[PDB]
Design a protein around this ligand. Structure first.
Ligand code: NI
Ligand code: NI
Ligand code: NI
Ligand code: NI
Lengths: 155, 155, 155
């Protein structure tokens, strides 16, 4: 203290980065390559484990550029002080399934991914490459008092 | 202090639970049974009232297991220090309305609910039973300074 | 300190408001009039700039009444201590694109907007007027320790 322990669970994992002095969170990288078609849901593995101390919670949340440009929706996960397992990114491709087809996948910048081997995809499908910035981790202090039942509130 | 007051508004309400030492939030239970079809929006009542003190905000947020497994999307509500009313869960069934039908409802674990009385439902419909863990409450300290307008930023 | 600097970037910008003593956040107003059809994504400009000090993060988040009543989904943006640019609201009209038409737009209260000049819109389209409360800003303390890689966690 004040130090957060980080455990890499595979060779695909990458150490989170907080480059600027002013930055609030840590860049979280994907440890796997996954293709998400319209409406598809998944929990993307980071192969990263952290030991958040008591009196804090980690917010594994979306990234500003990715969430604004793409239909990829990350549900902010609340990381407990007592969770030492693999950090998973709760994600949904919120693009509508209009049953149309295209030869182009989309990257996390919403650009068309040009392939030399031509394949057929559902329109609005995204590919997340291994090692890409898709999320960030912001840790905040928490207040956890012992609950007391009342019939009416005082003051 | 440090104690949070909790008020139960009906016999359907349940006292929030923070079982583990390390846990950041309190399990929030539903006080009503509701069936949400695709795209349907609702505010589910908890029949629970809290008196968060000044200098804090309550985050009435989604649950890790429910949000990952089901298309049920909870918008994290910001609970003011001056809100003593019924806590409502802002929820949407984000499952697409593909106009298909099935005889099975889905629980908060995304399992098919087997009924003895056969009924016809829209595909992707969920049922939330009374007294089920659907949300959690995480309270965090806040910073609220008196605003000052500037033409340029200093340092 | 304790004071947050606010910079207005145009005549369309409005000073954020924290009216009640108990309120956790500041009302954020739109600086532009925009019509969002089903599934459409945009970053609405506030023309407001803030200088959050180090050791804090700003949560530019949804509003309780708007998010519950309308299909307008705001992704909570994490505002760094080192961001002095225009605050943008990351928004999506999550209403399904069922290819139906209506003569009525919808306001942020989900009411039909009556026009004297009759126009044809896609069903589930919303209009956000300039100067309307669409979001709020909640600032919270953060914990940013220097990371240390471990092979196993201690205690
Ligand atoms: Ni090849
Ligand atoms: Ni029966
Ligand atoms: Ni959707
Ligand atoms: Ni006119």
């Amino acid at each position: 203290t004040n130090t957060l322990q980080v455990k890499l669970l595979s060779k695909n994992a990458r150490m989170p980065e907080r480059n600027h002095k002013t930055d609030a969170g840590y860049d979280i990288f994907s440890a796997e390559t996954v293709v998400l078609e319209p409406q598809e849901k998944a929990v993307i593995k980071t192969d990263v484990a952290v030991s958040i101390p008591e009196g804090y919670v980690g917010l594994l949340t979306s990234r500003s550029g990715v969430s604004s440009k793409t239909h990829l929706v990350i549900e902010t996960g609340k990381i407990d002080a007592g969770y030492h397992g693999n950090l998973g990114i709760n994600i949904k491709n919120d693009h509508e399934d209009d049953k149309m087809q295209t030869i182009f996948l989309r990257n996390i910048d919403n650009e068309k991914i040009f392939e030399k081997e031509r394949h057929l995809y559902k329109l609005g499908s995204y590919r997340i490459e291994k090692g890409e910035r898709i999320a960030q981790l912001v840790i905040v202090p928490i207040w956890t008092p012992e609950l007391k039942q009342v019939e009416e509130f005082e003051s």
